[PDB]
Design an enzyme around this catalytic site. Structure first.
Site, PDB file in Angstrom:
ATOM      1  N   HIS A 271      -2.447   0.516   8.966  1.00 24.95           N
ATOM      2  CA  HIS A 271      -3.365  -0.331   8.117  1.00 24.95           C
ATOM      3  C   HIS A 271      -2.209  -0.966   7.190  1.00 24.95           C
ATOM      4  O   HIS A 271      -2.078  -0.575   5.935  1.00 24.95           O
ATOM      5  CB  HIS A 271      -4.399   0.506   7.642  1.00 24.95           C
ATOM      6  CG  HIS A 271      -5.225  -0.474   6.655  1.00 24.95           C
ATOM      7  ND1 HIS A 271      -5.810  -1.575   6.964  1.00 24.95           N
ATOM      8  CD2 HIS A 271      -5.341  -0.197   5.232  1.00 24.95           C
ATOM      9  CE1 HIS A 271      -6.322  -2.006   5.843  1.00 24.95           C
ATOM     10  NE2 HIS A 271      -6.197  -1.361   4.808  1.00 24.95           N
TER      11      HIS A 271
ATOM     12  N   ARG B  99     -11.061  -8.233  10.927  1.00 23.32           N
ATOM     13  CA  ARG B  99     -10.791  -9.601  10.435  1.00 23.32           C
ATOM     14  C   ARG B  99     -10.082 -10.444  11.288  1.00 23.32           C
ATOM     15  O   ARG B  99     -10.356 -11.749  11.482  1.00 23.32           O
ATOM     16  CB  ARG B  99      -9.465  -9.262   9.401  1.00 23.32           C
ATOM     17  CG  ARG B  99     -10.002  -8.400   7.649  1.00 23.32           C
ATOM     18  CD  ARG B  99      -8.903  -7.980   7.007  1.00 23.32           C
ATOM     19  NE  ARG B  99      -9.314  -7.745   5.872  1.00 23.32           N
ATOM     20  CZ  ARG B  99      -8.866  -6.995   5.062  1.00 23.32           C
ATOM     21  NH1 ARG B  99      -7.739  -6.226   5.256  1.00 23.32           N
ATOM     22  NH2 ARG B  99      -9.394  -6.753   3.616  1.00 23.32           N
TER      23      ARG B  99
ATOM     24  N   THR C  19     -10.415  -5.612  -3.164  1.00 25.74           N
ATOM     25  CA  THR C  19     -11.461  -5.964  -2.042  1.00 25.74           C
ATOM     26  C   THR C  19     -12.325  -4.925  -2.038  1.00 25.74           C
ATOM     27  O   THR C  19     -12.236  -3.711  -2.394  1.00 25.74           O
ATOM     28  CB  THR C  19     -10.590  -6.029  -0.656  1.00 25.74           C
ATOM     29  OG1 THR C  19     -10.167  -4.690  -0.121  1.00 25.74           O
ATOM     30  CG2 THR C  19      -9.322  -7.070  -0.627  1.00 25.74           C
TER      31      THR C  19
ATOM     32  N   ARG D 198       0.900  -1.084  -0.014  1.00 22.29           N
ATOM     33  CA  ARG D 198       0.050   0.021   0.011  1.00 22.29           C
ATOM     34  C   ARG D 198       1.001   1.157  -0.004  1.00 22.29           C
ATOM     35  O   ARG D 198       0.511   2.364  -0.541  1.00 22.29           O
ATOM     36  CB  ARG D 198      -0.924   0.011   1.359  1.00 22.29           C
ATOM     37  CG  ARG D 198      -1.788  -1.158   1.165  1.00 22.29           C
ATOM     38  CD  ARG D 198      -2.584  -1.168   2.451  1.00 22.29           C
ATOM     39  NE  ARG D 198      -3.449  -2.070   2.901  1.00 22.29           N
ATOM     40  CZ  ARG D 198      -3.245  -3.363   3.341  1.00 22.29           C
ATOM     41  NH1 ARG D 198      -1.890  -3.717   3.362  1.00 22.29           N
ATOM     42  NH2 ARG D 198      -4.096  -4.367   3.329  1.00 22.29           N
TER      43      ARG D 198
ATOM     44  N   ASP E 177      -9.219  -4.364   9.845  1.00 25.11           N
ATOM     45  CA  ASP E 177      -7.781  -5.246  10.398  1.00 25.11           C
ATOM     46  C   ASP E 177      -8.333  -5.937  11.402  1.00 25.11           C
ATOM     47  O   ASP E 177      -8.214  -6.994  11.512  1.00 25.11           O
ATOM     48  CB  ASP E 177      -6.658  -4.379  10.417  1.00 25.11           C
ATOM     49  CG  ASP E 177      -5.995  -4.126   9.102  1.00 25.11           C
ATOM     50  OD1 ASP E 177      -5.551  -4.972   8.432  1.00 25.11           O
ATOM     51  OD2 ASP E 177      -6.302  -2.806   9.002  1.00 25.11           O
TER      52      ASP E 177
HETATM   53  N1  LIG Z   1      -8.642   1.385   3.762  1.00 25.22           N
HETATM   54  C1  LIG Z   1      -8.883   0.197   3.285  1.00 25.22           C
HETATM   55  O1  LIG Z   1      -8.777  -0.800   4.170  1.00 25.22           O
HETATM   56  C2  LIG Z   1      -9.194  -0.095   2.082  1.00 25.22           C
HETATM   57  C3  LIG Z   1      -9.471  -1.078   1.364  1.00 25.22           C
HETATM   58  C4  LIG Z   1      -9.690  -1.567   0.229  1.00 25.22           C
HETATM   59  C5  LIG Z   1      -9.274  -0.451  -0.913  1.00 25.22           C
HETATM   60  N2  LIG Z   1      -8.722   0.602  -0.328  1.00 25.22           N
HETATM   61  C6  LIG Z   1      -8.109   1.651  -1.277  1.00 25.22           C
HETATM   62  O2  LIG Z   1      -9.409   2.354  -1.884  1.00 25.22           O
HETATM   63  C7  LIG Z   1      -8.954   2.916  -2.945  1.00 25.22           C
HETATM   64  C8  LIG Z   1      -9.690   2.880  -4.071  1.00 25.22           C
HETATM   65  O3  LIG Z   1      -9.926   1.253  -4.192  1.00 25.22           O
HETATM   66  P1  LIG Z   1     -10.835   0.910  -5.452  1.00 25.22           P
HETATM   67  O4  LIG Z   1     -10.854  -0.787  -5.724  1.00 25.22           O
HETATM   68  O5  LIG Z   1     -12.223   1.392  -5.211  1.00 25.22           O
HETATM   69  O6  LIG Z   1     -10.260   1.252  -6.941  1.00 25.22           O
HETATM   70  P2  LIG Z   1     -11.081   1.629  -8.162  1.00 25.22           P
HETATM   71  O7  LIG Z   1      -9.892   1.698  -9.317  1.00 25.22           O
HETATM   72  O8  LIG Z   1     -12.286   0.586  -8.722  1.00 25.22           O
HETATM   73  O9  LIG Z   1     -11.858   3.113  -7.783  1.00 25.22           O
HETATM   74  C9  LIG Z   1     -11.082   4.213  -7.893  1.00 25.22           C
HETATM   75  C10 LIG Z   1     -11.744   5.344  -8.304  1.00 25.22           C
HETATM   76  O10 LIG Z   1     -10.908   6.612  -7.787  1.00 25.22           O
HETATM   77  C11 LIG Z   1     -11.505   7.555  -8.967  1.00 25.22           C
HETATM   78  N3  LIG Z   1     -10.655   8.571  -9.117  1.00 25.22           N
HETATM   79  C12 LIG Z   1      -9.585   8.933  -9.560  1.00 25.22           C
HETATM   80  N4  LIG Z   1      -9.324  10.099  -9.451  1.00 25.22           N
HETATM   81  C13 LIG Z   1     -10.142  10.778  -9.044  1.00 25.22           C
HETATM   82  C14 LIG Z   1     -10.135  12.365  -8.502  1.00 25.22           C
HETATM   83  N5  LIG Z   1      -9.374  13.299  -8.582  1.00 25.22           N
HETATM   84  N6  LIG Z   1     -11.358  12.725  -7.929  1.00 25.22           N
HETATM   85  C15 LIG Z   1     -12.288  11.873  -7.811  1.00 25.22           C
HETATM   86  N7  LIG Z   1     -12.470  10.293  -8.194  1.00 25.22           N
HETATM   87  C16 LIG Z   1     -11.156   9.907  -8.662  1.00 25.22           C
HETATM   88  C17 LIG Z   1     -11.324   6.694 -10.133  1.00 25.22           C
HETATM   89  O11 LIG Z   1     -12.081   7.246 -11.509  1.00 25.22           O
HETATM   90  C18 LIG Z   1     -12.085   5.556  -9.650  1.00 25.22           C
HETATM   91  O12 LIG Z   1     -13.460   5.591 -10.140  1.00 25.22           O
HETATM   92  C19 LIG Z   1      -7.527   2.602  -3.263  1.00 25.22           C
HETATM   93  O13 LIG Z   1      -6.663   3.449  -2.881  1.00 25.22           O
HETATM   94  C20 LIG Z   1      -7.633   1.299  -2.326  1.00 25.22           C
HETATM   95  O14 LIG Z   1      -6.058   0.903  -1.910  1.00 25.22           O
HETATM   96  C21 LIG Z   1      -8.413   0.914   1.081  1.00 25.22           C
END
Ligand SMILES: NC(=O)c1ccc[n+]([C@@H]2O[C@H](COP(=O)([O-])OP(=O)(O)OC[C@H]3O[C@@H](n4cnc5c(N)ncnc54)[C@H](O)[C@@H]3O)[C@@H](O)[C@H]2O)c1
Ligand SMILES: NC(=O)c1ccc[n+]([C@@H]2O[C@H](COP(=O)([O-])OP(=O)(O)OC[C@H]3O[C@@H](n4cnc5c(N)ncnc54)[C@H](O)[C@@H]3O)[C@@H](O)[C@H]2O)c1
Ligand SMILES: NC(=O)c1ccc[n+]([C@@H]2O[C@H](COP(=O)([O-])OP(=O)(O)OC[C@H]3O[C@@H](n4cnc5c(N)ncnc54)[C@H](O)[C@@H]3O)[C@@H](O)[C@H]2O)c1
Ligand SMILES: NC(=O)c1ccc[n+]([C@@H]2O[C@H](COP(=O)([O-])OP(=O)(O)OC[C@H]3O[C@@H](n4cnc5c(N)ncnc54)[C@H](O)[C@@H]3O)[C@@H](O)[C@H]2O)c1
Lengths: 332, 332, 323, 323
Positions: free
Chosen positions: C194, C170, C239, C107, C167
């Site tokens: 995380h 889980r 996820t 990450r 976490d």
């Molecule tokens: N904190 C957690 O536990 C956790 C868990 C899972 C995923 N994540 C993270 O969440 C984030 C998104 O994951 P995802 O699977 O939904 O990815 P995804 O690719 O399916 O969706 C990402 C979205 O972000 C949009 N985006 C990009 N630039 C943007 C901007 N300036 N303004 C608004 N929207 C914008 C994209 O167009 C897209 O729709 C990632 O960083 C991922 O690592 C965090």
């Protein structure tokens, strides 16, 4: 731990046993997972089983759900390819199959998904002879008929999700124009879950008032014109979302959770779902389409046989003819 | 502990502040506590305040509720006689007052409860000038008018629970005969929350089908006869329960939770609640009675002005005359 | 038309057009953003839900799909677009936008890409909802919560990372499956990053009010927890469902003012010997003012050492960021 | 008539008239029984709710009052009467019937009166629902659970006393108010007699996965817990709302098969040096088979001594009962 919990726990029931509300979802695609997520949010199952043919996506989806179990009330979430996992399911939701490409009719999925059903349904019946089948796969009206034939089930336990979603869409669009919650606008869509569906103009109602009683200018012609425009948006809705998004998932997930709620909780609520309508509206072939049905723990306990208007019955007869035109060409 | 938590907690907001969904229930009797219990089960308030004039019953009820807080999502439950506790309430539910003895009309409570309102309402307005008032005390139509006059509030923020419960009773009785859930039978009761209430025969509906469309024999006379019998049971229901049980509590508690849900959650759902209907149905005095209203976080955002049948309008005009016959005799 | 006739068969009693009282915005309508939106809708937390992204078609399609299930929901307004004016006066803003992990990718390797995205998002959020609560989900969540704090100028109570709420869920699920009880009755805390350097608080483990000592391999379970996301990413690509549920959980406590305790990302300078402005998960009390209180626990020597290392691992990446 | 026309505008597809799958019976429609029934209805646990009592008028009035709110519920059949044939094939039977405390009266002083009532109730319950779960609420709950076990001949897993689920809820609420957190994140156990000799398990206290030692007067709080019912009885005459919520909580775990842990009344012979057939509260795992597992905790010397005393206090009254 499985070794050492044996001495800070006293077991009083050496015999653990089956689940009382075991629900199986076949297909862990967009629709299957939205349905499983909605079923979990409604706390309907103590055991949820996911079946598919892609092992790696199966396991990843299973783990993803499992890991939010702190926030749910479903102590067993399991997944696999072996239908033995589904044994003694109360309810089996079939979402597997080909979905529409941009511009593609649901009826153009029929041969691919009949072939898929020829494998799925016998395996379901083998391990859950007493379950309710809830068909979501398109074209849903024909595949409910197909599931009925393949399963040998009585009509009460073979249900197509049908026009529950079309009716929800219709009620959203109308209530949107008025500015009230869709739960207080009452109107139903019957017939094919597709281009030939039928708005029931005679039954439009707001919170116990016939639509005609809202305003002197709301007459039969006003209602026909309104619904002409709204119903076009209803039939088009899925196509536009497929063009924009690729597929639909969230609204059908909620619709299937709605139907599952009435079935699992024995609520005897009325839903427009797909069932056999030979004998109604002048229909004489074994066609399934959406009519209002009472749903509970025995599946469809009753089917409404309403006296609708001449035009509505004729539109429904035409809807059945459209379905039959495709259905006659499948081989079982 | 209040001394020693000061060093395993870091305070990041030295300024705690008000609650965003503060709800006050006035009267901790049978109705008040059933309403408070239903409001708590719906998780509508982060602060619930109970007001009454009997200190010992107040404190005991408060403690009883407080002690089930593990099972709720309302972190502050408080009670007292001082209206300062109610300050800045979003919603104030007034259930205080005399209730019916066996055989007693709700209209025979009017002088006792006007006197009670003359004290309650000014104190409510003093500490919550912007709240929604939801009147439950009988006779509810007259006391909503009274609360409106005493409070100086705009019409949108003075609501009587009205015929929401009568309509729920009516839908239960009819759906019981059919064998479906009451949520799929649509019919409303308007007018007085009492003996002169008005069934809206023109709007009876099952899940998007006009009642007339269920069966050729369901005609205007069939509907008039059915409702003659069902409506008699509706108007009698409270009297029979009072004779058997002494009072009613659970159904009105659920009804008030239903109304509070639409108000607090801004749902714009339609409910038959008591509001001013001068200008409708030929009514020219300032009479409140139940008509369908859109409810949200501003109280009543809209009132329906329907075009009902001649008979229905005349029955509603008669209902308003019955209310006015009692209302003209109170002095404010 | 029905639009014209409603003007006549309804009497407006209010000519005021107030603002929603629980307006929630989700930035990013990807897999995480939509799962979050769906969970928030199922929990009936918002009377107005706003979806923001930069892909117009997918936005509108997702909005329409959600809207058409409105009959089964209690959220009367669902809207989506590119213009942050849609987000004005939001109570809660959930930021899920940005690059996500490829198979086997830390990450921490996402941070410079998503800092760039945040330099656009956060000032636009703050322009239209200066009093909102920011809930950061995008990875690496601990650094990006720090970033959001710096770009927004918000007080610490209103900048929250989803952190180790997931976490911990889980961890509790895995231990609960071995015992055979529901995970809500097993109490176990995972703090820190995380990510790979998270820390199980083995000293705090408890079942329904019984300490373990009232009743090795709990380190083994923690390893399954750190690897879980990688495994799902390998199997599924990403996820979504568990984090959506975890965000809905956090959102419930914030929106309903519950004063519940969650392990979320906040500034931990001054704890565990950390002198840098590092955010990581510690237990925090959540309500309508955001984080009202942060716990200062007195952990074992091994646990506070593990947290210091976690902080150093985060700082090692955070220090290289240009902001 | 609508009764005759439904025979024609509906087509029955099933001529089978199956039995409800979650039939719940409440014995006693007093203050406790109705609060229990109302909570169970709000939690949508039953498709059929049966109310049994011996006062025909109050039964019918309470039944009608509940029925008329059916629109707001998900329980399609609510019935009430004197005849236990109405209870046939119940999954869960909640027994709340009997004498209650006057101001300042020990729950233990109720036992001979309520044993007599149980000698009528329990054999009638067992005649019509031999496979049901019995959940005993009437006081003194620990002895009457023993009584129900002896009269029913049921296995131990299907005879459960509501026990200290309520006392623990009260304890957790009181401590949580001093800290300023939601009681669901404070974990504290009260075991033993539902009454004056209950025992706080101070060794097990915990906040969201932090033991107290990670962070005197907790005995003071326990005294407020033992006195709480007496105080409410003095102020209000009785208690109802908290036990109704606590019964709904227990019912949820049983009906939904959650395998959650509750401190409920069950046989504790063989624990804490107890050689008599005494029931009191220890933590138990609850699901659709009733109590599947009972915890054997290793408490402090003071806590196991306090539990032994509790057992002796119960036994001192139980031994005098003619059954
Ligand atoms: N904190 C957690 O536990 C956790 C868990 C899972 C995923 N994540 C993270 O969440 C984030 C998104 O994951 P995802 O699977 O939904 O990815 P995804 O690719 O399916 O969706 C990402 C979205 O972000 C949009 N985006 C990009 N630039 C943007 C901007 N300036 N303004 C608004 N929207 C914008 C994209 O167009 C897209 O729709 C990632 O960083 C991922 O690592 C965090
Ligand atoms: N009834 C409705 O209102 C409605 C709404 C939306 C979609 N649908 C239909 O739902 C169905 C699935 O749509 P989707 O978006 O989830 O597509 P999807 O591509 O996301 O998922 C389809 C799943 O079916 C699986 N599958 C294929 N053959 C299988 C087999 N023999 N056994 C088990 N699993 C098998 C696939 O592996 C895949 O995971 C389509 O037919 C779609 O048209 C119906
Ligand atoms: N609208 C409906 O559908 C509906 C249904 C049932 C009952 N009701 C009415 O609700 C009202 C209460 O009924 P109940 O069964 O709860 O009676 P109740 O006797 O149980 O309680 C009435 C409460 O009002 C309190 N009270 C009296 N004067 C007060 C004052 N100045 N300020 C604050 N509190 C005061 C009393 O101390 C008492 O606690 C009655 O008027 C009843 O007719 C209405
Ligand atoms: N376990 C707890 O935490 C807890 C809490 C509160 C009260 N209680 C106890 O619950 C019991 C009831 O309390 P309550 O306030 O509801 O009393 P109540 O007087 O209001 O109701 C008692 C009911 O029991 C009925 N009853 C008597 N004999 C019966 C019989 N053979 N069959 C069926 N019903 C019969 C009565 O007719 C009456 O309706 C008491 O024993 C009380 O001490 C236990």
């Amino acid at each position: 731990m499985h070794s050492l919990k044996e001495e800070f726990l006293i077991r009083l029931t050496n015999e653990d046993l089956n689940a009382s509300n075991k629900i199986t979802v076949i297909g862990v695609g967009a629709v299957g997972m939205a349905c499983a997520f909605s079923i979990l949010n409604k706390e309907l199952a103590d055991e949820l089983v996911l079946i598919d043919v892609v092992e790696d996506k199966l396991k990843g989806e299973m783990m993803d759900l499992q890991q939010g179990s702190l926030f749910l009330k479903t102590p067993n979430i399991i997944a696999g390819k072996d239908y033995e996992l589904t044994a003694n399911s109360k309810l089996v939701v079939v979402t597997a199959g080909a979905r529409q490409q941009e511009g593609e009719s649901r009826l153009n999925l029929v041969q691919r998904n009949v072939n898929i059903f020829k494998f799925i349904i016998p395996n379901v019946v083998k391990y859950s002879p007493d379950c309710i089948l809830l068909i979501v796969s398109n074209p849903v009206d024909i595949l409910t008929y197909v599931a009925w034939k393949l399963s040998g089930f009585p009509l009460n336990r073979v249900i197509g999700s049908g026009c529950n979603l079309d009716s929800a869409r219709f009620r959203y669009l109308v209530s949107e124009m008025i500015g009230i919650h869709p739960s207080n606008f009452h109107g139903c869509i019957l017939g094919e879950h597709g281009d030939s569906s039928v708005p029931i103009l005679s039954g439009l109602n707001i919170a116990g008032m016939s639509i005609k009683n809202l305003h002197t200018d709301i007459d039969t012609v006003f209602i026909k014109d309104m619904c002409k425009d709204v119903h076009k948006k209803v039939t088009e809705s899925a196509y536009e979302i497929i063009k924009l998004k690729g597929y639909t998932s969230w609204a059908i997930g909620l619709s299937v959770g709605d139907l599952s709620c009435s079935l699992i909780k024995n609520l005897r609520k009325v839903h427009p779902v797909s069932t056999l309508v030979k004998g109604q509206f002048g229909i004489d072939n074994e066609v399934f389409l959406s009519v209002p049905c009472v749903l509970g723990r025995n599946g469809i306990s009753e089917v409404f046989k309403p006296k609708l208007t001449v035009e509505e019955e004729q539109q429904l007869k035409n809807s059945a003819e459209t379905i039959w035109n495709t259905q006659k060409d499948i081989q079982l």
